[PDB]
Amino acid sequence: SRSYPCDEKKQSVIAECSNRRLQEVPQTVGKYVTELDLSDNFITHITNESFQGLQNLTKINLNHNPNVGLNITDGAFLNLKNLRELLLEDNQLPQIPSGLPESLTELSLIQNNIYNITKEGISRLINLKNLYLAWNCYFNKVCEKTNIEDGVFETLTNLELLSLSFNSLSHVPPKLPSSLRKLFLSNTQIKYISEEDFKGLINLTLLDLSGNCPRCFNAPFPCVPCDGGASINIDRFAFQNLTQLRYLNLSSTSLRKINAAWFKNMPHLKVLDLEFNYLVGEIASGAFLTMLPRLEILDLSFNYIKGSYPQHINISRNFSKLLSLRALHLRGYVFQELREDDFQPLMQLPNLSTINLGINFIKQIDFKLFQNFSNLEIIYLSENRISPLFEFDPHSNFYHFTRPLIKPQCAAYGKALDLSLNSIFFIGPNQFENLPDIACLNLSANSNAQVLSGTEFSAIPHVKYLDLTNNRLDFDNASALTELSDLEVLDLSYNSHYFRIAGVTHHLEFIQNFTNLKVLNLSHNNIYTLTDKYNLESKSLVELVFSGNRLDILWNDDDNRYISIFKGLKNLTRLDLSLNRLKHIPNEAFLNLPASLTELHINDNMLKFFNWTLLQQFPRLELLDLRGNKLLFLTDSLSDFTSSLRTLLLSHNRISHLPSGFLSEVSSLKHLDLSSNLLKTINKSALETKTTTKLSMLELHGNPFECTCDIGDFRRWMDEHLNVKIPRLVDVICASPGDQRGKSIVSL
Amino acid sequence: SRSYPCDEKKQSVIAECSNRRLQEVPQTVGKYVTELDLSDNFITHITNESFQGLQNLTKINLNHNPNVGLNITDGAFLNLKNLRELLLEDNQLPQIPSGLPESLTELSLIQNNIYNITKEGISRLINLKNLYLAWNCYFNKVCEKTNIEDGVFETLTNLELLSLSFNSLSHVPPKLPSSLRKLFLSNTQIKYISEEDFKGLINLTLLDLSGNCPRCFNAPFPCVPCDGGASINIDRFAFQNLTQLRYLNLSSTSLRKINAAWFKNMPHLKVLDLEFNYLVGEIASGAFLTMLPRLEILDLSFNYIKGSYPQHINISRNFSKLLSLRALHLRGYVFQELREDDFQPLMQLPNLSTINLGINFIKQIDFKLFQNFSNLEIIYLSENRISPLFEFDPHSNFYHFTRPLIKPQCAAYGKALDLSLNSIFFIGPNQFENLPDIACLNLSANSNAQVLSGTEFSAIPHVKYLDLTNNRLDFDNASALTELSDLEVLDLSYNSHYFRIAGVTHHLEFIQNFTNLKVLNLSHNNIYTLTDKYNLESKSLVELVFSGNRLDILWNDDDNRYISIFKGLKNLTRLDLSLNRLKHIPNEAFLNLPASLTELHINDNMLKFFNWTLLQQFPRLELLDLRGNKLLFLTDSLSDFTSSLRTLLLSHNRISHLPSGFLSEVSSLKHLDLSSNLLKTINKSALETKTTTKLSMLELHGNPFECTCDIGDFRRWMDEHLNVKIPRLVDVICASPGDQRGKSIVSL
Numbered sequence A, B: 001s002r003s004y005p006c007d008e009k010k011q012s013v014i015a016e017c018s019n020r021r022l023q024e025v026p027q028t029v030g031k032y033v034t035e036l037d038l039s040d041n042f043i044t045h046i047t048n049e050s051f052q053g054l055q056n057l058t059k060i061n062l063n064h065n066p067n068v069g070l071n072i073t074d075g076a077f078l079n080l081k082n083l084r085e086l087l088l089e090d091n092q093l094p095q096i097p098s099g100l101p102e103s104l105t106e107l108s109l110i111q112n113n114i115y116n117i118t119k120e121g122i123s124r125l126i127n128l129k130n131l132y133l134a135w136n137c138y139f140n141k142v143c144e145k146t147n148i149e150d151g152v153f154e155t156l157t158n159l160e161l162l163s164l165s166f167n168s169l170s171h172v173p174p175k176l177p178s179s180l181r182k183l184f185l186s187n188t189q190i191k192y193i194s195e196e197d198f199k200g201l202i203n204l205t206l207l208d209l210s211g212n213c214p215r216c217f218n219a220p221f222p223c224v225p226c227d228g229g230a231s232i233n234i235d236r237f238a239f240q241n242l243t244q245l246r247y248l249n250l251s252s253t254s255l256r257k258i259n260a261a262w263f264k265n266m267p268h269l270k271v272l273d274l275e276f277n278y279l280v281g282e283i284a285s286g287a288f289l290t291m292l293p294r295l296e297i298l299d300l301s302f303n304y305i306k307g308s309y310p311q312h313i314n315i316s317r318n319f320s321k322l323l324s325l326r327a328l329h330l331r332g333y334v335f336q337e338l339r340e341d342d343f344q345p346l347m348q349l350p351n352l353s354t355i356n357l358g359i360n361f362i363k364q365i366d367f368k369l370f371q372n373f374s375n376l377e378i379i380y381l382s383e384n385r386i387s388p389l390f391e392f393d394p395h396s397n398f399y400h401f402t403r404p405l406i407k408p409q410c411a412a413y414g415k416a417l418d419l420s421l422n423s424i425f426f427i428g429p430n431q432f433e434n435l436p437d438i439a440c441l442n443l444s445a446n447s448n449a450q451v452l453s454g455t456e457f458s459a460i461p462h463v464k465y466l467d468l469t470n471n472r473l474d475f476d477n478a479s480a481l482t483e484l485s486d487l488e489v490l491d492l493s494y495n496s497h498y499f500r501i502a503g504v505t506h507h508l509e510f511i512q513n514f515t516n517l518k519v520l521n522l523s524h525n526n527i528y529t530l531t532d533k534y535n536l537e538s539k540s541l542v543e544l545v546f547s548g549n550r551l552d553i554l555w556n557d558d559d560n561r562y563i564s565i566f567k568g569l570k571n572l573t574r575l576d577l578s579l580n581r582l583k584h585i586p587n588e589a590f591l592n593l594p595a596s597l598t599e600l601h602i603n604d605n606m607l608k609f610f611n612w613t614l615l616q617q618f619p620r621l622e623l624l625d626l627r628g629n630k631l632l633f634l635t636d637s638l639s640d641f642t643s644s645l646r647t648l649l650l651s652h653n654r655i656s657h658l659p660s661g662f663l664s665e666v667s668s669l670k671h672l673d674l675s676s677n678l679l680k681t682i683n684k685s686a687l688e689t690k691t692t693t694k695l696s697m698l699e700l701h702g703n704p705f706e707c708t709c710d711i712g713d714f715r716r717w718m719d720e721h722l723n724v725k726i727p728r729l730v731d732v733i734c735a736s737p738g739d740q741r742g743k744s745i746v747s748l
């Protein structure tokens, strides 16, 4: 029996049951299921019958039910002897639910309406390791100060993580377990940290005190400062017994001075976050810096003085004692010029690999200074003024984004310089003098309108990944970029400015000159006319992204000039012609696509016709993507035209008929996506081969199926081929007749 | 009887029958219909039965049938004694159809496959005034040279317009009617114009000879030059008897010299088009210019010398004899600098109002020179390099676009300067010195990232319409633009660059300072956080476009800061909150919308809920647009909440139920759009008032209607309210049951 309404899975056994409009815990869950995800449904009541006979349940996720309060009876879960993880986020719960099972090691009640943390609801959960209560009372929510029963956490002697962020606390609760490794108290309205607060927490590796006495100017959320925008008050001995602290978060605590004695018994401190404070003075002096010879990451972002646009950044000499430092983040300090001598203190630190000066309104940099660091790998200068020479995710970081500064594919080639979002509108015979051996260069969004001519990158000739996106480049010279012999990836996306104008000349001939070029992105360039040379040619190129151009124009029926546009891409395996307004492709142009292709995307066009017989000329073709078109016709003889194709994507088309022996004899086809077409039925001979079907996935959701006895053949087929996954059966719905309408074809 | 499948109309009586998937000329056309539009259907055969009993037909449009050859029997139309205009474009016709009715005054056979123009098909059509045969053989189409039977047009003595463009002709046909006013022979492969060719065409006001011996370098279409890219050869006396010529089109005829004697007997010539020739030398000397004292429009665009980037443009002194000149178009000449003395010859011409220098790669202009013209009104400098100081529509112009240079709403305020698509990335204490009294200023797409501060426009303080779109403006000063006291329209669209960054400050306070500001466009700015002042305020503002911002964030449930964001817009009547990702609007924020509103758009959001009762606080509200959301619920008591609302737009929502007495008692509602929702039926009490319904339009197409006997009530209602137009009944389709599926609810 193919499972329903949940999708079950492989490896422990998962019931994927989220987001399928369920009203109750459905009663047809596989009795062998260990993990049940019921999140994002319309479930409103939970009782002792809800999970009965699912006694092997280890994890239940009920996050985000119902979608626009969850009712949980006392003891509702108390049966499930093996229940370890219970996730009850975003449920509008008024209280901790009563009579939870003592087997719990993980309980998340994030984003509910619980202002009372009691012994009654918690103190018995003696096996709890992770307890999450964040984001119950915050910002301008109408909510109550949170009452924590004295001693409530004391009995929890296995507790390693406790999160109370984004609740109104006022004080650090007394009588916390000495088992704690991670304590989260961000934005809890605590103004004073005493000596007793953390005294017995000798296993703590992480303490987050961010957002208490916040710096409120220009906050993107409702923000309540401490009287007079004063600092957090942290007793001299607050951290004296926290010898195992690796992580300390003091962002937006309105700090003006950092007491070096806070760090005296913290020899392992690794990551220190001091964002959104007032530490310009502390950065320029910085006694505390001497206490941190093992620090790896230091974040001093958004410490700018309101109203101030100083000429220079002022870094203490004491930064030279940060011997382990690997990353320094100095965004939002705000300054006009970076000179060589201003970073002297950083230049001997052996492991300093990332310098982040994002968002400083810097107008000029003496670039030669970067060489003098011992080993930079990521010089991040995005979003400055350099010129020619849930509202908030409770499970994310609130003060910044955690994404890599540089795209990992670009940074993997070596040393990276990101000058994106500046004003280098023209390079510059000497723009890149005195730089290291830059491998990854990001010049996206610099308003560049120059004609590149083959000499502009001559001082950084080993760039291997070049990002030129979102400029205004005038591609009017056949030698552009040819100085970059090692170039492997080139991204020219969103440079439509001159391609748009038919009366200026356009030259893409340089593409052929590269011997190592693997990936070229020409997307969203509105390319519809080229000058003299009408063809793209390269012996190396493996991937071309040609989405968001005008192949409808290039391949217009009355024009032969571009019918070989891609044929000289002799090595190509992956081609993307999406978003090109194509109504049909001339036969001859389709036949002139590279025979090497393994992957072809023509999705989101307006294709009314596809010549399937032309697939014969593409013996390596494995994936064909035709989603989002206006196709009506499937061939009845695919096996005559291909023995390679593994995946065929056809969702969002107008196919109302699957032909007799459609499947036959297409051995290679593993995945067929027919979702969102106009199929009313599927007849017995449509899926039939007497040969061996390797079909493992068939998508059918969003078809207007007629649920009369004519569906019974397909139903029988589903019974007889349990190995062919049909996902989201709850969305494989009857459109007709009216008694059936809305119901899954399976439940009939 | 409500008509079907066509929509009939008012004023002569129109059958709008286009684009509704018809297979035959439908037989249910109103016998009183004078004009029948059957274009864009799937019609494949036309016979003598097709229009029978539609004897009052004056005009038939069969353009673009079938959609992917039309068959017309001999004499098929010969009945229709009153047929004057027959439109048979884009039909893939192999021949002129035989036995057309001699009543024809207008025949269009554009874009067919007709290579033979015969007496047999044409010579009897003695009343023809306009005959269109263009675009039958062209570019790389597989087609034949066109054979014109000698004398074929001679018998057509009422012919005033003849179009043979985009066919292969080789020679001007002999024996053309002397009745001609307009002769179109563009791109006909004629290389020589003799003395006999136009000798007897003394009524001609227009001659188009463009595209014969074309200039082919960088053409955006297949283009065949005359041997050696030679010029068109026009005999000295070719135009000697064309005294009534007003329009002459010689674009792309590869002209290097213009013979002044061509214009000797052309005293009324008004518009002369000399685009895409090689007239740089002729522009600098230009004897022919002396022959043209009545010329109003002169177009010399794209006469650039390939490969050449001269410093200056060189205009003959002879331009000073163009006494009537009103517009001069000099795009694509290509030059580096415009100096005062270079336009001396233009400065005394009293009526010269438009100068177009688009697309010249101009780097600098001495702006003071514009003042010295007698009266410029449109100084068009778009798309240069100024710095801080159907494939082709057969019914359009092929060599340029015909749109206004400047938007008519901007140009209507007075003198216009369009500096769009340049590199004025910073203004400039002296940027606008020595200009006339500029009323309409276009600075769109100049990569501007400055902080405007209230002094930048002080030398052009009477700008009334200001276009700042598609820049990178840093709105970080409360005085920005306040020097512009007369400003009425301000467009700040697509300046999301700094609004996107939460950690920089953002200031929109200046808005309040203007006393005449009527229209403000803040669209696509990703606005989600502002500094200090959270409200937009203006006592004058009548229209705010706030589409493509983040009201979902601004109005987040946990934040009160922005719940009055628009309430200080005390005069507002039109507000656009589309494309703001709204899932719902807090009640209090909706109630704080200006009570003056007459027009409110919240389309293309994700609204799952709408509080209809809040409409009580908006007594002037006439149009509510909620299309493109996820609404399920309509109130049953609209009349309790509004007596003003005239138009309610709800297409593309999820409404499956119309309530009992929905219509009641909403006197004011004229137009209700319920297309593309989930209605299965409409019950009798849903549309029922015993009061007076002023409903004149009801849209229902794209609803999954169940066509059983439960539809009969609505059908009866349709019969009983013929005055309530339901458009596109062919698209008001049955989804169920399967016998009915696909069929219009009306035809059941």
Ligand SMILES: *[C@@H]1O[C@H](CO)[C@@H](O[C@@H]2O[C@H](CO)[C@@H](O[C@@H]3O[C@H](CO)[C@@H](O)[C@H](O[C@H]4O[C@H](CO)[C@@H](O)[C@H](O)[C@@H]4O)[C@@H]3O)[C@H](O)[C@H]2NC(C)=O)[C@H](O)[C@H]1NC(C)=O
Pocket: A182, A186, A206, A208, A210, A247, A248, A249, A271, A273, A393, A394, A395, A396, A397, A398, A399, A400
């Ligand atoms: C103050 O600084 C501290 C120390 O840096 C910082 O601690 C980090 O908090 C976040 C919680 O926001 C933790 O990140 C989570 O870690 C867990 C456990 O490994 C993961 O499950 C989470 O990943 C899931 O969720 C993500 C976001 O939705 C998804 O993108 C992801 O793909 C997963 O689904 C998430 O990474 C992080 O571990 C701690 N750091 C530790 C313990 O070292 C804290 O957030 C800062 N405080 C504030 C208020 O900013």
Ligand SMILES: *[C@@H]1O[C@H](CO)[C@@H](O[C@@H]2O[C@H](CO)[C@@H](O[C@@H]3O[C@H](CO)[C@@H](O)[C@H](O[C@H]4O[C@H](CO)[C@@H](O)[C@H](O)[C@@H]4O)[C@@H]3O)[C@H](O)[C@H]2NC(C)=O)[C@H](O)[C@H]1NC(C)=O
Pocket: B182, B186, B206, B208, B210, B247, B248, B249, B271, B273, B393, B394, B395, B396, B397, B398, B399, B400
């Ligand atoms: C050479 O120059 C000549 C002289 O300027 C130029 O003549 C113009 O040709 C066009 C045909 O392209 C005519 O424009 C049409 O005029 C008719 C009649 O009034 C209108 O019906 C047309 O408007 C409809 O079609 C438009 C385009 O689809 C729609 O936008 C519009 O809204 C209407 O539906 C259209 O305006 C124009 O009248 C003549 N000029 C005259 C007679 O003065 C000629 O095209 C140039 N040749 C080439 C090849 O470029």
Ligand SMILES: *[C@@H]1O[C@H](CO)[C@@H](O[C@@H]2O[C@H](CO)[C@@H](O[C@@H]3O[C@H](CO)[C@@H](O)[C@H](O)[C@@H]3O)[C@H](O)[C@H]2NC(C)=O)[C@H](O)[C@H]1NC(C)=O
Pocket: A409, A410, A469, A489, A491, A493, A519, A520, A521, A523, A543, A545
């Ligand atoms: C221009 O096109 C290039 C090449 O297609 C785009 O880069 C590619 O982006 C895709 C994702 O869109 C990357 O693949 C993904 O990466 C991770 C694995 O690392 C995986 O999770 C995903 O399932 C998927 O494989 C791909 O690596 C990346 N390629 C390179 C060379 O960087 C680029 O994004 C396009 N540019 C723009 C502006 O759209």
Ligand SMILES: *[C@@H]1O[C@H](CO)[C@@H](O[C@@H]2O[C@H](CO)[C@@H](O[C@@H]3O[C@H](CO)[C@@H](O)[C@H](O)[C@@H]3O)[C@H](O)[C@H]2NC(C)=O)[C@H](O)[C@H]1NC(C)=O
Pocket: B409, B410, B469, B489, B491, B493, B519, B520, B521, B523, B543, B545
């Ligand atoms: C920013 O918003 C302004 C104001 O809404 C936009 O300008 C307006 O554009 C509309 C059309 O989108 C114009 O109305 C139309 O004009 C003609 C009549 O002249 C009519 O045919 C149409 O039915 C409709 O009325 C409106 O006049 C124009 N307003 C002004 C003051 O110019 C502007 O386009 C927006 N900018 C961007 C970049 O989107």
Ligand SMILES: *[C@@H]1O[C@H](CO)[C@@H](O[C@@H]2O[C@H](CO)[C@@H](O)[C@H](O)[C@H]2NC(C)=O)[C@H](O)[C@H]1NC(C)=O
Pocket: A382, A405, A406, A407, A410, A418, A420, A421, A442, A443, A444, A445, A467
């Ligand atoms: C080059 O710089 C641009 C701009 O910072 C980067 O674009 C960002 O890319 C990430 C993910 O690729 C997106 O989620 C952000 O939206 C982008 N921001 C903008 C403004 O586009 C780009 O990724 C950087 N490229 C490389 C190779 O590191």
Ligand SMILES: *[C@@H]1O[C@H](CO)[C@@H](O[C@@H]2O[C@H](CO)[C@@H](O)[C@H](O)[C@H]2NC(C)=O)[C@H](O)[C@H]1NC(C)=O
Pocket: B382, B405, B406, B407, B410, B418, B420, B421, B442, B443, B444, B445, B467
């Ligand atoms: C200001 O300049 C811009 C760029 O030339 C104009 O934007 C064009 O507007 C027309 C119609 O409004 C569009 O059909 C074109 O697509 C636009 N081009 C681009 C690149 O956006 C704008 O209309 C001009 N504004 C005024 C008021 O004249």
Ligand SMILES: CCCCc1nc2c(N)nc3ccccc3c2n1Cc1cccc(CN)c1
Pocket: A451, A474, A475, A476, A498, A503, A504, A505, A506, B304, B306, B307, B308, B309, B332, B333, B334, B359, B361
């Ligand atoms: C109307 C433009 C004619 C041909 C042309 N295209 C370009 C272009 N894309 N960018 C330019 C940037 C600066 C100057 C000219 C162009 C340009 N031109 C004219 C041109 C002049 C000299 C040399 C070249 C080289 N292709 C082209």
Ligand SMILES: CCCCc1nc2c(N)nc3ccccc3c2n1Cc1cccc(CN)c1
Pocket: A304, A306, A307, A308, A309, A332, A333, A334, A359, A361, B451, B474, B475, B476, B498, B503, B504, B505, B506
């Ligand atoms: C991290 C930025 C802090 C506040 C700020 N926002 C801006 C901004 N939007 N544009 C600038 C352009 C140039 C220099 C600074 C800013 C800027 N800043 C810092 C700032 C410094 C001095 C004065 C001001 C005036 N609002 C703001």
Ligand SMILES: *[C@@H]1O[C@H](CO)[C@@H](O)[C@H](O)[C@H]1NC(C)=O
Pocket: A323, A324, A325, A350, A351
């Ligand atoms: C710098 O990094 C390397 C590991 O990559 C490590 O071996 C060395 O100990 C580091 N130096 C310091 C002072 O932390």
Ligand SMILES: *[C@@H]1O[C@H](CO)[C@@H](O)[C@H](O)[C@H]1NC(C)=O
Pocket: A515, A518, A539, A540, A541, A542, A571
């Ligand atoms: C073709 O692409 C493959 C895969 O990257 C690469 O190894 C090979 O070097 C390329 N061939 C040529 C001729 O460049």
Ligand SMILES: *[C@@H]1O[C@H](CO)[C@@H](O)[C@H](O)[C@H]1NC(C)=O
Pocket: A587, A611, A613, A614
């Ligand atoms: C498909 O292309 C082949 C070219 O190999 C041709 O024989 C056949 O005519 C094409 N089918 C259609 C419908 O154009």
Ligand SMILES: *[C@@H]1O[C@H](CO)[C@@H](O)[C@H](O)[C@H]1NC(C)=O
Pocket: B323, B324, B325, B350, B351
């Ligand atoms: C300039 O234009 C006006 C009409 O606006 C007209 O009266 C006058 O005759 C024109 N002058 C010439 C020389 O054509």
Ligand SMILES: *[C@@H]1O[C@H](CO)[C@@H](O)[C@H](O)[C@H]1NC(C)=O
Pocket: B515, B518, B539, B540, B541, B542, B571
């Ligand atoms: C309000 O708008 C109307 C319509 O433009 C205008 O006449 C009036 O002057 C404006 N009112 C104020 C106070 O500016």
Ligand SMILES: *[C@@H]1O[C@H](CO)[C@@H](O)[C@H](O)[C@H]1NC(C)=O
Pocket: B587, B611, B613, B614
């Ligand atoms: C609609 O808004 C009014 C506020 O006047 C309120 O009484 C009613 O509760 C609102 N309805 C909903 C469903 O929020």
